[PDB]
Design a protein around this nucleic acid. Sequence first.
RNA 1: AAGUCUGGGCUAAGUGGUAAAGGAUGUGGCGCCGCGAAGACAGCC
RNA 2: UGGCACCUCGAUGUCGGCUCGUCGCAUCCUGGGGCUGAAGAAGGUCCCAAGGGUUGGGCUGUUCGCCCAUUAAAGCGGCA
RNA 3: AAGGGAUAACCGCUGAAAGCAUCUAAGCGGGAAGCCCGCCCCAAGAUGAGGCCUCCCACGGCGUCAAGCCGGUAAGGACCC
Lengths: 58, 204, 159, 138, 36
Amino acid sequence: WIVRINAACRQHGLNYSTFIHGLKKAGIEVDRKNLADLAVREPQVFAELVERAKAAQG
Amino acid sequence: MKGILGVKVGMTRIFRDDRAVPVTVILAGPCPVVQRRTPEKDGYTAVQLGFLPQNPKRVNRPLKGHFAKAGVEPVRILREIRDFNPEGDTVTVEIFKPGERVDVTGTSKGRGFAGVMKRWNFAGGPDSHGAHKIHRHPGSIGNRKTPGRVYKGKKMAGHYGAERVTVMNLEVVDVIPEENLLLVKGAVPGPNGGLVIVRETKKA
Amino acid sequence: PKGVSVEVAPGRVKVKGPKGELEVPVSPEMRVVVEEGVVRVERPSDERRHKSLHGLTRTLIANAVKGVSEGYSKELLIKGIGYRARLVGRALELTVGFSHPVVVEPPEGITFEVPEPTRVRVSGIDKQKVGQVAANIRAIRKPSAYHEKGIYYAGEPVR
Amino acid sequence: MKTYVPKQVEPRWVLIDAEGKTLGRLATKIATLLRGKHRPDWTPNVAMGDFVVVVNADKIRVTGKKLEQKIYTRYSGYPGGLKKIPLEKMLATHPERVLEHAVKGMLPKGPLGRRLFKRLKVYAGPDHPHQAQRPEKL
Amino acid sequence: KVRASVKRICDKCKVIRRHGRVYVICENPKHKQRQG
RNA sequence: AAGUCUGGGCUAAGUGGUAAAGGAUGUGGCGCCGCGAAGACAGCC
RNA sequence: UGGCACCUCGAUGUCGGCUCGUCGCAUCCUGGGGCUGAAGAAGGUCCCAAGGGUUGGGCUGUUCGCCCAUUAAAGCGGCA
RNA sequence: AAGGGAUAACCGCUGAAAGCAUCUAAGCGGGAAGCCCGCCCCAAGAUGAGGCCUCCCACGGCGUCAAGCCGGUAAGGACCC
């Protein structure tokens, strides 16, 4: 889960370390590394989550 | 690189100035060039001759008349001579003049399964005093726990002879252009009636 | 100087003069381009590495400059009894004790001289090469022999 | 269930050449490509990395004083059969080898590890004598 | 010549570090040393 | 598996990647002492 | 040469010789080199260097040693 | 062994840091029975299975349609002697 999340979110600018910290502050106790298969099905919606994440991050 | 194919016929000795020289007679018959190796399509530079011509037309796929001088591909086949590119029209003996120096490849006589102390000239053990079941044996072949194995290359018994062998820098005593003959300074490898190739040496 | 044409490249420097031109390789640790009636050479921060390169630079340039307005120099005083020199071509057949006389080729830029039969000098536009080939001759027989034989510099004898 | 799992997609090819770059600092990323570790198919048991062609080998920068100092080694199974050959001599002859050795070491060591080392094509160049694609990365 | 404590045996001796090693160069040939 | 993450310094020995008495104008940072228009510290009267 | 007693007492043959080797360099010869109280020749002493070489007999079970006759030298060690 | 290239101790050129001097810190030359290549031998299971010359080519009858098909061929190759 982690190896491919990293691959996917590294494809938008940032890295895994950063992405998870973001979500933490962003208040989305969600992804559940399991359920970041969103990266493969519906990357539309992954993209959204990355925005929220870098929202709390920069 | 000057170079004919040929065959050991046998040896004797002649006299010269005032002493006997030992000589071994090669028949290096006429060697019809059949293929040239270019660096442009082969990558290396060489020439393929042929030797014992005689062949009652059993020649099928390699009929390859394809180079003019296809006059019946030889019984004793054909070998390349590396960097050697003559006036393309057969090579006789004339290339070698008396007093020239030559290397000679050949096929040593075959000793078969040879014992150590022939294969390698070992000492073996005493014909008397102590033991009796090891007169011709090799003795030890290792140490103990370290390294606890036998060295790659160890000299032990096995097949000896029947091998490619080049003896270097023999003198050309004489040459009978007449008969396609070549005389060298004794001792050339293998048995009579054996294929050999004869080149220039590398000397001083 | 007078008939000198001090040219410049990225990392090299070409000095044209009445005797010819020479090629000095010069480090990226400066910006010197054809400047004024002479030439100035500067350098960055006063750290050990730079310091050592300034001065080195300053002289190779100056040596190439004095080379292109004739920079020949160097002479060997040959001593010993049977010992003496003889010019053959622009090459040198000196004889110094061995069971056999000694011949010597001059490469590009260089000529040997035989004023005396026991004196010699080496002409050169370069400099590195001159001092090199000077020693190369001295080699053939250096001195020592609780005094006497062998082929010396302008410098002199010892215990 | 959640087996995110791939299905076989068409393998991509790539051309690259940091001819001016520090090897190791190069070879690292190459390998990360030879495994599908950049793409989120990643599946550890399968081989869906990129095929990779590297033009203009040799030329590579090597830090410090690593000529004569970096020594390469081969032992034949024989007595005194050690060979020691320094970096200088490897670029001098067989420089395609240098970047090859360096990537090998960063690849896993199973059968699948050898399979990926075959996906890596190295030419002291330029000119990579096979054209049928190559989305060059810089 | 070759010793562990190399020092200066005269007023003509000279300490130069060349080859990454420590040496000593006097006028008389006998005081020429090298650390090893 | 997770930063070729950020900011300031040192080291050119692959030190790092395992050793002492004792040696050295290796470097970088502090010193507090000679004495310098009785203007020689280095070089030819 | 010893100290200690950790695997081995339902067994790990023990001195010397012979046969077969292989490796270390702290080098006996042969190859480079610096000093010398190196005139030359011949040495002394230290540095680089194993690539290959490193004899035959008398005495004793001997290892080792002493002795005869030679040699460019008749090297020291590891591998139970 | 000739020979070619790179080196060890060691012997030099040019050269500052340090107006002098220094083989060195940027560069450049010499230099061993030693290293690399050269000589002789093995070698494409070098699964990275190479290259060149010459030859032989037809579907003839059936499945998840090129053998995963059986039975005769071709250039060739075995068997027996």
